[PDB]
Amino acid sequence: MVKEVNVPDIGGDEVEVTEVMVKVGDKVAAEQSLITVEGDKASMEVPAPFAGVVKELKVNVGDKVKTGSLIMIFEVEGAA
Predict the structure, then answer these.
(1) C-alpha 11 chain-centroid distance
(2) 73: Cβ–Cβ under 8 A, 6 or more apart, which residues?
């Protein structure tokens, strides 16, 4: 049962990905950072909208994300 991953709150405007911490199959949980995002003079981070594992992601490091954007597709466990 897949689920989508959006970008919650990243303070302002538009940001890009500097460190895409998780990958295709990883173990993610809320509050546990997902992707480190940049854009101005500061460095920001984006945690997990919810918990489970990662399945697929049409995003790169140096690519763009902003509030709502479909970061990647998760699937809430799936007895690996």
Answers:
(1) 15
(2) 2, 3, 4, 5, 54, 55, 56, 57
Query: Which tokens is 17 given?
Result: 């990905």
Beta carbons of 75 and 4 less than 8 angstroms apart: no
Terminal-residue alpha carbon distance, the chain: 14
Q: Is 9 helix (H, G, I), strand (E, B) or coil?
A: coil
Q: Which CATH class is domain 1-80?
A: mainly beta
**Residue 77 has which token pair?**
């466990």
Listed in sequence order, the residues at least 6 apart from 20 whose beta carbon sits closer than 8 Å to its beta carbon are: 35, 36, 57, 59, 60, 61
Q: What type of residue sits at position 45?
A: E
The structural domains of the chain, with segments of one domain joined by +, span 1-80
d(CA 65, CA 14): 7
